[PDB]
Paper text:
Carbonic anhydrases (CA; carbonate hydro-lyase EC 4.2.1.1) are metallo-enzymes that catalyze the reversible hydration of carbon dioxide (CO2) to bicarbonate. In this report, we describe the first crystal structure of a psychrophilic α–[name] from [name] ([name]), a psychrohalophile isolated from deep-sea sediment. PprCA has the characteristic [name] fold consisting of a ten-stranded, twisted β-sheet that is antiparallel except for 2 pairs of parallel β-strands and a few short α-helices. We also show that PprCA is functional and retains the structural core that is conserved in all carbonic anhydrases.
The final model was refined at 1.5 Angstrom resolution to Rwork of 13.9% and Rfree of 16.8%. In addition to protein atoms, the final model includes 1 zinc ion in the active site, 1 chloride ion and 342 waters. The zinc ion in active site of PprCA is coordinated by three histidine residues (His 96, His 98 and His 115) and a water molecule, denoted as Zinc-bound water. The PprCA crystal contains a monomer in the asymmetric unit. The dimer formed by the crystallographic 2-fold axis buries 751 Å2 of total surface area and superimposes well with other known bacterial CA dimers. The dimer interface of PprCA consists mainly of symmetrical polar contacts between hydrophilic side chains, water molecules and the interfacial chloride ion. A chloride ion was built into 8σ 2Fo-Fc electron density at the center of the PprCA dimer interface. The chloride ion in the dimer interface of PprCA may represent halophilic adaptation by PprCA to a high salt environment.
Numbering used by the authors:
A (entry chain A), B (entry chain A): 14 to 230
Write the structure that this text describes.
């Protein structure tokens, strides 16, 4: 239905999804100027498995089993899925990355929090991505992972983050979404990112204005 | 048209003003739990005069002449008006105040910023309020101030503030509004606040959820 370019592209998401066009607390943003703040460490307890990839024609999405939980702000947000954008949607200090992962979590009441991880180029294939992407499903299809994989291993080692209040970056672009963007990029070889990009195409939403928000670190 | 209670009261503002019902970055809030952050001092340069009071059936609003400017975030926000709510709309640490002033500023491009000042009870009449409120207009009317008054003198001496990203507290409840709530209350005698309340009635919007925001100090 909706797309990135064309008649149903980002410029027209408001036709069916009002918040995409009317909201002024949207994601993505350029994380450039920031405010130093006293922020609690995230509690990311990922103990389960990635089971499958789904291609819904918008992204490649990984689904999970087991207990994979983000605890922050006194709320318990279970990891629902993670998925990818090529190129990145958010920027860090004016830099766009080749690949960005969104780990999307929800409280049992439905409140959403996204942990974003940038993937920059490195010389070596990322082993966890090799496992994850061994078979990437085509549009409208799903593939069961051949091999075991814990999503914990896709997070960077260092867990410092930028925090802001934003939205989903895809329709319905709902607001009230906590964003935690990890400061340290993970690595993906250029070949790995190209493999994903050739399936997904350009599925990065354009940058949105910060407006009255401050970005914290 | 719109009101606080009844058919067109706060519970029904969404009928004509969608953001009032759909927004999740709204004002007012209870400023209770906060995040320590490195925030720039506000630059409040009020050098003009309060000319008149207008009663638009929603509040008592004071209009200005001269140069009265808030500079923050590299943007220049000119004071457009200030007005009052009885009781307060925002709370500080779970406490509602008898009276809250909103100093509403706009950049020349139209972007809005509100400086909020709580007024608590004190033994002495506030001299600037005595001047300001010597004649309070009835609904649908305006009164020219009898005496000179610089709005600077209504701000607290100490300028430390809480900051959050929110909305107008009246229709259209627009978002993308910077809120700077002064930490130090000003003083108004109980008699002065009662004088205003008897004209305005209860024009405080109920508290709104913080959602994904953090309040900074
Ligand atoms: Cl915010
Ligand atoms: Zn995403
Ligand atoms: Zn107000």
């Amino acid at each position: 239905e909706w797309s990135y370019t064309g008649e149903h592209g980002t410029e027209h998401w408001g036709d069916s999804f009002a918040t995409c066009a009317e909201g002024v607390n949207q994601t993505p943003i350029d994380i450039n100027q920031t405010t130093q703040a006293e922020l609690a460490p995230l509690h990311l307890d990922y103990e389960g498995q990635v089971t499958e990839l789904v291609n819904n024609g918008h992204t490649i999405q990984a689904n999970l089993t087991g207990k994979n939980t983000l605890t922050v702000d006194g709320k318990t947000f279970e990891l629902k899925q993670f998925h990818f954008h090529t190129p990145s949607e958010n920027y860090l200090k004016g830099k766009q990355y080749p690949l960005e992962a969104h780990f999307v979590h929800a409280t049992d009441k439905g409140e959403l929090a996204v942990v974003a991880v940038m993937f920059d180029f490195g010389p070596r294939s990322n082993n966890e991505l090799t496992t994850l992407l061994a078979s990437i499903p085509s549009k409208g299809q799903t593939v069961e992972l051949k091999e075991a994989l814990n999503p914990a291993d896709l997070l960077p080692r260092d867990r410092e983050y930028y925090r802001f209040n934003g939205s989903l970056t895809t329709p319905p672009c709902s607001e009230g979404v906590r964003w935690f963007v990890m400061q340290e990029p993970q690595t993906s070889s250029k070949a790995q990112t190209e493999k994903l990009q050739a399936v997904m195409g350009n599925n990065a939403r354009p940058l949105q204005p910060l407006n009255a928000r401050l970005i914290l670190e």
